[PDB]
Amino acid sequence: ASMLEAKFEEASLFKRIIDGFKDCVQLVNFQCKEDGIIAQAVDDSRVLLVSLEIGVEAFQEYRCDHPVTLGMDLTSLSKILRCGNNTDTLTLIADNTPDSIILLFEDTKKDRIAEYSLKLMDIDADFLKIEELQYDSTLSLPSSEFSKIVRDLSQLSDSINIMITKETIKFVADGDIGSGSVIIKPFVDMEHPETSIKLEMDQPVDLTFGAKYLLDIIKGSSLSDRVGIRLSSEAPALFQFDLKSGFLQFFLAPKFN
Amino acid sequence: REEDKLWTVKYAPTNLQQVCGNKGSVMKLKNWLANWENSKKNSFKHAGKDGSGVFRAAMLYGPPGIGKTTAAHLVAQELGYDILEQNASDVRSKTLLNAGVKNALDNMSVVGYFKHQNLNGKHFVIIMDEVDGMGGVGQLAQFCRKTSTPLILICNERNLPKMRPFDRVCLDIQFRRPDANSIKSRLMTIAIREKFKLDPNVIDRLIQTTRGDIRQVINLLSTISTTTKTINHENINEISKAWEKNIALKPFDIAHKMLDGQIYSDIGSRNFTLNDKIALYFDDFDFTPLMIQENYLSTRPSVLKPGQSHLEAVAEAANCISLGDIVEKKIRSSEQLWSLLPLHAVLSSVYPASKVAGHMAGRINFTAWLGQNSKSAKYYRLLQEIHYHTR
Amino acid sequence: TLSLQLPWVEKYRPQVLSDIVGNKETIDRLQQIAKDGNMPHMIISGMPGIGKTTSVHCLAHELLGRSYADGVLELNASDDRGIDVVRNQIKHFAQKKLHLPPGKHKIVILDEADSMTAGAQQALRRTMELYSNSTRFAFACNQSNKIIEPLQSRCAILRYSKLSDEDVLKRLLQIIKLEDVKYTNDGLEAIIFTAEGDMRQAINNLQSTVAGHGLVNADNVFKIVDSPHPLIVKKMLLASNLEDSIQILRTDLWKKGYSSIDIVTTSFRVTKNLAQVKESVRLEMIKEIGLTHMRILEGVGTYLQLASMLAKIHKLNNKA
Amino acid sequence: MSLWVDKYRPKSLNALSHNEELTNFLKSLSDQPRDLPHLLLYGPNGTGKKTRCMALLESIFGPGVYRLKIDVRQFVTASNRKLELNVVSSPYHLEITPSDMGNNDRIVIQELLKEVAQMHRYKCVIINEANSLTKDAQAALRRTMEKYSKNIRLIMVCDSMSPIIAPIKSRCLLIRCPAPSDSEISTILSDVVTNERIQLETKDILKRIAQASNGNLRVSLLMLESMALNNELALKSSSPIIKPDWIIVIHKLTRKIVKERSVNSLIECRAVLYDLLAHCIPANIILKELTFSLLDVETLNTTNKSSIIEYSSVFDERLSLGNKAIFHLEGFIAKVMCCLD
Amino acid sequence: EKRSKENLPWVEKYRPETLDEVYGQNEVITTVRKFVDEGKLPHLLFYGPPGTGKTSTIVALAREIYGKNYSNMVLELNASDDRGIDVVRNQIKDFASTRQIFSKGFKLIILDEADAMTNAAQNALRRVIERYTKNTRFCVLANYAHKLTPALLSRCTRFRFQPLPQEAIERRIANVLVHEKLKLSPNAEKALIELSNGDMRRVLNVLQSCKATLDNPDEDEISDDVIYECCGAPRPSDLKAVLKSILEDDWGTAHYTLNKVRSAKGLALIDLIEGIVKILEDYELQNEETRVHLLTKLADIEYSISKGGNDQIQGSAVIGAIKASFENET
DNA sequence: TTTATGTACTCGTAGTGTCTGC
DNA sequence: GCAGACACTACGAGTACATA
Ligand SMILES: Nc1ncnc2c1ncn2[C@@H]1O[C@H](COP(=O)(O)OP(=O)(O)OP(O)(O)=S)[C@@H](O)[C@H]1O
Ligand SMILES: Nc1ncnc2c1ncn2[C@@H]1O[C@H](COP(=O)(O)OP(=O)(O)OP(O)(O)=S)[C@@H](O)[C@H]1O
Ligand SMILES: Nc1ncnc2c1ncn2[C@@H]1O[C@H](COP(=O)(O)OP(=O)(O)OP(O)(O)=S)[C@@H](O)[C@H]1O
Ligand SMILES: Nc1ncnc2c1ncn2[C@@H]1O[C@H](COP(=O)(O)OP(=O)(O)O)[C@@H](O)[C@H]1O
Ligand SMILES: [Mg+2]
Ligand SMILES: [Mg+2]
Ligand SMILES: [Mg+2]
């Protein structure tokens, strides 16, 4: 009946996707289209940019004829997702340019039906066309390894400096307690294809990043088994987490000097 | 080494005969710590010759830089007692204090075992230096009640209410401003040891301006000797004015300085301008309005205008005190206008004391409006109780 | 968006102790400390913009050289200097073992030290007293009253004074000769008058006038930056004719876009800092200005209130 | 109870033998209570305003308003300070007073009036001593009675009109309660004494009580009870008019001010004022009594009287805008001493 | 926003989109344009009365320096946003320390109504500004200077926004009338100039309300008569008549005249008090006591009216004050 | 020591989460 | 794998300052 219908196979997928970038972003601007649903949202400090995108293949059924701009709030969105059984099948429902959306928390497949609604939020910020560019480097390491390295190094300094030069990844973080120098040599394994340190090389890069923002990035490591980092001296860092049908980037802004 | 250590460290006293002044207090501390074990064998059931047999704990206070820490260290080391100090740089929270020296209240010194005749080099003497840097005070008091080791405390202001529980649980030893002769001799030795000339009449003014702070005097000597080794009576006023210490002032002394008739005289206002009066009020802005009101009518006025009696000045001061009440009510309300503090300063302290300035008829009394207001509040509560019960 | 040129305030910041002008005795003492190496604990105080923190940074640079990356720990209000999360930082830094030249020590620049809490200074007391051989501290606060007396009892008091006009003019002429901008002595004295001994204000006004008109002539200076309104307020309050005071008020403050509350606060500050008239007269002037201040803060802000304030100030001043 | 002030109180308008016109007006209001507006009774204290309020309440609904209970309500403010203020509730009405601390009675008003408005169609809310509100709870009340009115009604009792702000005067009906006449005071006291067992030599004692009470029936009944207890239940024509110890203290202070006009006498005046403020007395009434006792001294002049009354007005204005009344009272006494000397 | 323009008030519809659209402050605008063309931009501090065009100027400046999406490249903080010292320690520090995320440029921080920031927040902002000034510029918009720390005042270049003169208001009004297909008589324009008191928002609001007042928006011209009923301000002729009746006529005539003038079209005693104040300031008075008495009594009356009260007693007070003040002069 | 909001700091506690282990 | 252990973030109550 309603114009926009998006029935998830399970509420767990949407719960995990929302909780991936719930902490680092307050206001989210969903833009539903026939190709899929995207969400470009900017941090309060305007340093970390999140670009969610879910393909049509992650929905059990999906239909949206007219483009819809769903500006929302992640705090109340997560509060709405907090209540409701995780096994239930969520069905996003919205009207033609509505004031709210309807969260069908259909329990199991019968009996109990919920009608949680969140008032839509007027976010007039247009989507930012920051897709990609000629990146100097393109590495690819397992999410668990990157999360462990970032968690270990965040305790030693407030800044993690990522350096790539001559087929080698090097993380350094000089601080007060000490100075970590975790290094990774690229390799590939046929036995366990998941763990493979892929790498590409155009020009060496020496880009430094904050610790709290990198921790916010690695909070989303549960979504994807692999994380792909691309760096450039004249581009924000890209952290492409691969999803079941889409992805979840993290455009982090490096420090200068 | 030399030339790479602070002057206040290399010239620290080495024995109890190198302390400038406070001979009586150091002597008292030495007697107390030299007879603690006899009191322990006496189970603290009676006092001694000087009364040290009843108090297992002592506390030291005084102006900064006069020698409390040095006296404590030398007294502890001379008898061989192993020092065990807690400081403001470490945590003195209740849980960590119970997890800290609580077990050390009756243990023994393992380093005292390994160091060493030193008969009494095998015990802890406990040093809470900087007590004022704080339920820590309650735990310290309960430690003072029950301790099996010598225990002293070092603070600065006993009169603070947070050391009120220490009223009769410690053997108080008070350190005062030392007399200028010993400091004069010490600076003569220092000057002849560090190649710079010093003029005897200069030490008196240095102690007077520094307000009896020997450590700051040594720092002053070092800093001056960095570039001008010769100290004479020419630049004495320049150095005194440059290194004058703007110490905070106590409420009774604030009332005394505010009611002194010299500051409102024509000659006395060249140096002590009303801006200094505002700065003096702002030291304690919660007690000065109460202190001025309760003793502005118990003085001989010395700034009476011609043809004006004392009662007229009292009334004209009371008018501005009443105005300051309204100003304060606007300050401490829902509007919460705290930019109005300088106006309240004038209207509540400066102008009312600019008409009744003079010597005290009696002496400055503590504020009674606080106690009267507390008793009135309790009486109001009891009146409400009986009003509601009988209704 | 092109990369911005560094402002002349930061481009021409001194890097050696010689370039700092004003307070010749203090600068010479700092130089003797620099070559001597026996830096004591000091607290530096003064009015803003006269060269407090730049002297600290220059001395830290001069005393220890290539060790400047890790041999000095700089703290400021932007760092969360609290009692608990920060006592460990200085405790570790002072306890840190780094090999210096024989006469040099680690430096802890607690910049903007008047904003710290009481407990932080209480911990810093024994922190300074214990490791005096390894580390030395450098407080740089606008107001020394916030620093407790135990901290003042173990520090070297280095009071900076407001810069004399000659020293500001000398360094300004140095800046002109390095930048080669056409200047007139009347414009330079206008800059000096507007700055009121605040050096950074002088440099900023010089920047604005240079990049706004090319020539720093007095007319351009007064066109860009206005004369300091405390002087106008002091002129208004000291006038003898009520009509003259009202005209000065209107023309120079009400038609120049000054809020009534700003005029009242400036009048209060001028009156409390004034010394020509009798003390008692200043007392009634302050009382009346405060009454007008209460009226302004309660909601009614009007030219009429300021006019009444001036009228009653003239009533007290003219002795009825 | 054994006290005669709360033993003989007229329950109904029929027993209100005090004011024929006011009783008739109240009966006119009670004739059709379906559209009774919010009231505001003002007048001298001791007139009997609360008696009229309760009589009107039982004339609206019926008997049973006079049965009362106590229900303590816990109220939380900024930080975690606890100022639990009880409410004297009842079926068909609710009685509240701002006996709580004045700086935060606004929250008491806000949440209690919002709680009572969650639903014989309305419950009357009597607010005793409404003149003691601090212009903040009244701001809440402005929209409190205006928004919800078909479910809640206010009978806002206060002995003075000045502190009540203009909108509260605007949205409330005004009812005036004049003080009793001396003949009416004597008649009421005579009815009380003939229902009691006290023997009177002559009714001149009742007239003397009426004159001394100054239109205050409550203190008149209290003084009659005290005299009857002291006179062995038999009043004497030569019994002195007993005054409250507060009046004695005020008169002694006035005598000390009049006779001795030095600074030391001002010190004892300050001590007496401290004791009186410790003795649960509002500043307005003590300044009023001091002013009117000073003006009754026969050794004064008309110029001194005019100066005293003008400074009394000024310092009463200061009391209405001040926190610590002791400074204002001491200033008023200092000005009086300056003028008299 | 909804329905694009034509659904906004004239205050927010005619907001300048370019530095060329800002009138009045010619010197400030020219200096700022010279700054941004020469490539140097110091820490700016815009001070002035409300409605003079501070935030409009800085928004136009940020739009000119950056692209259309200026909000994506500027951290604009206001009093609505929380600005505690934790905010300064985290958001401002992260925005200043990092590099731009959308292009290559210097970070710009706009702190509108920064006078509401606490003292500790300004103390932290001091070192935040001074440390990271290499590639980050701070702009502070403050109506009140006494609430700003003198350290903060000594750090930013001070620009003063003067109240709008006659020509700027006339030019903006001409542009608005050209856009809106509206006609207005020159005397009404002069009345608007006198009514503005240096504010531009007042002008735009009065134009909007006067266009709403007219029965036919087209054809009919806005005269000063329509201005005076729509705003409710007293007419100058009414003030002159009231003052003449007070000065020469006796109490019966003066009181009746003031009551009739007030009740003719619902005038208030306020705006009439300072109308009389302006007219009396347009007089020459030989004795300073007349000026003193007038100023003190009229200020007391205006304060009492601001606190509210009985209007009849206040009008009688005004008449008595003026008549008692103009008898001491002779 | 009452004051009477708003801010900032500090501590303490209660759970909540992942990490080792048998 | 369930259980304990572990240190982490989040939350709540208390204190102290408020113009140079
Ligand atoms: N009486 C004294 N004679 C000689 N030197 C002294 C004397 N008192 C203090 N000093 C010098 O001051 C230094 C430090 O004195 P301390 O006893 O630590 O000061 P304090 O009594 O602890 O005051 P605090 O703790 O700062 S409040 C010593 O090392 C000496 O160099
Ligand atoms: N004596 C001086 N000689 C040369 N430049 C000076 C001098 N004093 C200040 N400056 C200039 O002032 C700017 C920075 O001054 P700072 O020392 O940072 O101000 P400040 O003394 O720290 O005052 P506050 O309290 O920090 S605002 C630089 O551009 C310096 O060149
Ligand atoms: N010089 C000007 N030229 C044109 N329009 C102006 C000018 N000054 C103000 N305005 C108008 O005034 C409206 C509101 O003023 P703003 O400039 O946005 O706010 P403001 O002037 O900074 O006042 P504050 O201090 O922020 S309340 C703008 O939308 C413009 O339409
Ligand atoms: N008509 C009346 N006849 C007899 N007594 C009356 C009458 N009206 C009031 N009273 C007396 O007034 C007293 C109550 O006064 P109260 O309402 O408390 O005055 P207030 O409201 O001013 O405090 C009662 O003791 C009652 O005896
Ligand atoms: Mg010590
Ligand atoms: Mg600095
Ligand atoms: Mg603005």
Side-chain angles (χ1 to χ4, degrees), chain B residues 391, chain D residues 4-10 12 15-19 23 43-52 157 159 180 184 188-189 191-192 216-218 221-222:
Chain B
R391 174 73 272 176
Chain D
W4 311 359
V5 59
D6 57 358
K7 190 184 288 186
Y8 303 71
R9 179 155 42 253
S12 166
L16 297 181
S17 172
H18 185 274
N19 271 328
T23 305
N45 63 6
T47 288
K49 297 173 284 292
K50 308 183 62 179
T51 308
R52 273 93 162 95
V157 186
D159 52 327
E184 278 181 1
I188 283 178
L189 292 168
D191 177 72
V192 161
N216 195 323
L217 183 62
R218 158 177 299 280
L221 276 176
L222 261 70

Side-chain angles (χ1 to χ4, degrees), chain A:
Chain A
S2 299
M3 176 178 73
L4 167 57
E5 51 158 14
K7 180 181 185 182
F8 276 117
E9 304 181 356
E10 187 177 2
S12 298
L13 319 164
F14 195 55
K15 204 160 184 169
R16 286 159 33 90
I17 286 183
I18 285 308
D19 293 352
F21 66 103
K22 152 192 52 188
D23 291 331
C24 59
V25 162
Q26 293 323 83
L27 294 174
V28 57
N29 187 2
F30 288 97
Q31 303 148 220
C32 303
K33 289 179 188 59
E34 82 278 12
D35 307 333
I37 179 170
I38 71 190
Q40 175 266 333
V42 188
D43 192 14
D44 291 331
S45 299
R46 305 191 81 61
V47 176
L48 191 152
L49 162 66
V50 178
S51 176
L52 182 63
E53 171 179 329
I54 302 173
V56 292
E57 291 77 10
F59 300 95
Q60 183 254 300
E61 60 177 8
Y62 177 79
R63 187 207 80 228
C64 180
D65 195 70
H66 203 47
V68 182
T69 313
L70 290 182
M72 292 177 72
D73 194 2
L74 294 174
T75 80
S76 298
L77 182 44
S78 70
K79 184 193 52 44
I80 287 300
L81 276 296
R82 269 282 300 98
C83 65
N85 184 57
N86 314 338
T87 309
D88 302 355
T89 47
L90 197 149
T91 309
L92 275 163
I93 283 298
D95 291 353
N96 176 352
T97 61
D99 59 356
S100 178
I101 62 170
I102 299 98
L103 277 296
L104 277 296
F105 269 130
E106 182 175 0
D107 186 21
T108 313
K109 279 185 181 179
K110 43 161 191 53
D111 203 11
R112 184 181 331 251
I113 296 172
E115 294 293 328
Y116 291 93
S117 186
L118 183 62
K119 301 203 106 188
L120 189 65
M121 178 83 98
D122 201 33
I123 297 180
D124 299 3
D126 291 331
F127 57 94
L128 277 296
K129 292 185 181 179
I130 311 297
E131 290 89 13
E132 52 92 13
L133 61 83
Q134 303 324 280
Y135 281 110
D136 294 331
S137 299
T138 303
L139 63 85
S140 167
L141 79 168
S143 55
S144 66
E145 198 89 29
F146 182 66
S147 66
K148 157 208 81 171
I149 287 175
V150 167
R151 264 211 290 280
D152 294 350
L153 284 191
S154 67
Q155 283 135 27
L156 269 67
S157 171
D158 186 74
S159 300
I160 294 91
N161 185 22
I162 304 185
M163 315 155 81
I164 316 170
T165 296
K166 169 35 192 173
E167 205 175 353
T168 293
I169 300 91
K170 177 169 178 51
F171 303 86
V172 290
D174 312 83
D176 53 356
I177 297 144
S179 65
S181 313
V182 174
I183 195 167
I184 296 176
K185 306 298 295 182
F187 81 109
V188 67
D189 176 37
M190 296 297 103
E191 177 74 19
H192 183 74
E194 183 266 352
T195 298
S196 175
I197 304 299
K198 285 308 176 181
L199 185 147
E200 268 84 7
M201 268 323 308
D202 282 4
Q203 284 178 353
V205 292
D206 178 27
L207 277 299
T208 184
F209 311 94
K212 44 186 314 194
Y213 293 114
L214 270 185
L215 295 175
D216 293 339
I217 309 308
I218 74 168
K219 298 289 95 175
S221 66
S222 166
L223 277 296
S224 298
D225 295 333
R226 311 297 314 282
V227 61
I229 313 178
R230 294 181 260 290
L231 306 182
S232 178
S233 177
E234 183 70 9
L238 194 144
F239 295 79
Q240 190 150 320
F241 287 88
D242 62 358
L243 294 172
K244 66 184 288 184
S245 68
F247 36 80
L248 172 71
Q249 292 105 318
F250 282 108
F251 286 76
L252 191 41
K255 300 188 181 309
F256 66 92
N257 276 30

Side-chain angles (χ1 to χ4, degrees), chain B residues 289-290 293-298 310-312 314-316 318-323 325-330 332 334 368-369 372 375-376 379-380 383-384 387-388 390-391, chain D residues 9 50 70 85-86 88 95 97 99 136 261-263 266-267 270 274-275 277-281 315 318 320-328 330-331 334-335 337-338 341:
Chain B
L290 300 170
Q293 188 266 353
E294 297 207 3
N295 48 47
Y296 85 99
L297 59 85
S298 71
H310 180 27
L311 180 61
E312 270 72 15
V314 168
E316 280 176 21
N319 202 340
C320 280
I321 295 190
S322 162
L323 285 164
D325 198 310
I326 297 183
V327 164
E328 157 197 331
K329 178 173 185 179
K330 293 181 176 67
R332 302 177 175 279
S334 306
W369 168 254
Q372 290 284 347
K375 298 287 100 176
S376 75
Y379 184 109
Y380 299 155
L383 172 63
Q384 297 282 351
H387 167 226
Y388 283 117
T390 61
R391 174 73 272 176
Chain D
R9 179 155 42 253
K50 308 183 62 179
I70 309 302
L85 172 61
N86 57 3
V88 176
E95 167 166 306
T97 187
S99 55
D136 296 334
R261 287 163 310 281
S262 64
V263 190
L266 194 144
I267 315 178
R270 192 142 64 86
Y274 275 126
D275 290 356
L277 274 296
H279 213 87
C280 65
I281 299 150
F315 269 101
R318 291 173 185 266
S320 172
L321 286 163
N323 263 357
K324 321 202 195 64
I326 182 57
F327 311 150
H328 310 287
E330 191 266 323
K335 280 201 183 299
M337 277 198 188
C338 171
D341 204 0

Side-chain angles (χ1 to χ4, degrees), chain C residues 137-151:
Chain C
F137 285 70
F139 305 86
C141 58
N142 291 56
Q143 193 165 190
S144 60
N145 296 161
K146 317 296 173 51
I147 284 168
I148 58 178
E149 65 183 1
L151 268 291

Side-chain angles (χ1 to χ4, degrees), chain E residues 54-56 112-113 141 201:
Chain E
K54 297 178 298 312
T55 175
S56 300
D112 182 82
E113 56 203 359
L141 318 178
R201 275 191 282 241

Side-chain angles (χ1 to χ4, degrees), chain D residues 146-304:
Chain D
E146 185 169 350
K147 190 197 318 282
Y148 296 116
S149 61
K150 49 155 298 184
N151 283 350
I152 204 70
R153 297 287 220 273
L154 279 76
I155 297 169
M156 183 152 183
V157 186
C158 65
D159 52 327
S160 179
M161 269 285 259
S162 299
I164 300 302
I165 66 174
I168 299 306
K169 288 176 170 56
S170 172
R171 55 195 69 249
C172 285
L173 174 52
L174 276 300
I175 298 183
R176 205 180 58 86
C177 301
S181 69
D182 284 317
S183 61
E184 278 181 1
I185 295 283
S186 284
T187 293
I188 283 178
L189 292 168
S190 184
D191 177 72
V192 161
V193 70
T194 188
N195 210 349
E196 272 273 354
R197 223 182 302 105
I198 319 299
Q199 274 51 51
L200 258 64
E201 293 191 305
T202 306
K203 281 199 56 178
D204 186 31
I205 289 305
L206 303 177
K207 188 61 64 184
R208 281 177 36 195
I209 292 302
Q211 293 179 357
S213 306
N214 189 359
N216 195 323
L217 183 62
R218 158 177 299 280
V219 73
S220 168
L221 276 176
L222 261 70
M223 281 325 98
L224 187 79
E225 185 168 10
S226 296
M227 285 198 185
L229 292 170
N230 291 314
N231 286 163
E232 322 299 329
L233 304 200
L235 290 194
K236 186 60 191 175
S237 57
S238 292
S239 292
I241 291 306
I242 193 66
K243 298 292 184 182
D245 62 358
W246 181 64
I247 306 298
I248 297 169
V249 172
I250 301 299
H251 272 75
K252 186 178 185 59
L253 192 73
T254 295
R255 274 201 304 191
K256 202 176 197 313
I257 289 174
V258 161
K259 306 312 264 206
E260 192 170 353
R261 287 163 310 281
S262 64
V263 190
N264 273 23
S265 182
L266 194 144
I267 315 178
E268 289 89 7
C269 286
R270 192 142 64 86
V272 166
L273 287 199
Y274 275 126
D275 290 356
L276 276 186
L277 274 296
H279 213 87
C280 65
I281 299 150
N284 307 58
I285 207 65
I286 184 182
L287 187 148
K288 168 189 182 297
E289 276 305 318
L290 187 54
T291 295
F292 279 102
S293 296
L294 269 158
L295 296 184
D296 290 336
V297 185
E298 51 275 20
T299 187
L300 270 72
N301 288 317
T302 186
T303 295
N304 301 323

Side-chain angles (χ1 to χ4, degrees), chain D residues 100-136:
Chain D
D100 195 77
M101 202 144 57
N103 50 14
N104 63 7
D105 53 36
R106 63 211 211 91
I107 62 170
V108 163
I109 291 299
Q110 287 153 5
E111 291 83 3
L112 202 163
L113 273 296
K114 204 43 52 193
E115 151 185 344
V116 67
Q118 63 84 30
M119 294 299 291
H120 186 146
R121 186 163 307 277
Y122 45 88
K123 324 192 71 203
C124 300
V125 174
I126 297 182
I127 310 187
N128 309 336
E129 193 68 330
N131 61 335
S132 290
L133 286 180
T134 60
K135 300 186 176 305
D136 296 334

